[PDB]
Amino acid sequence: MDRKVAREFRHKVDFLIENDAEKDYLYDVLRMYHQTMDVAVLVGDLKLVINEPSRLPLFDAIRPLIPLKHQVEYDQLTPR
């Protein structure tokens, strides 16, 4: 049952970025949060890529897959 989330997640991010280099790095950001498991790291990179409000959805976009506990803490770290 867990598969479309990837398409909707990748399709959404692509709808916002529409770029490749950006998605590559953003894809790298997620890969990092997976290995290092450091929410503080995701926020940093996500910013460098989401420096503009236009890429705001990335926060709410990634949250879903982001651990329920980390989701809240993710909110505590983010001002929005």
């Binding site: 867990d2 989330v5 590559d24 894809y27 949060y33 997976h34 879903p64 651990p67």
Partner: peptide, 18 residues
Amino acid sequence: DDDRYLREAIQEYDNIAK
């Protein structure tokens, strides 16, 4: 819904190799 969707999308890209 935790520690499952991440690998789904993460690995999905790992397969795409884009």
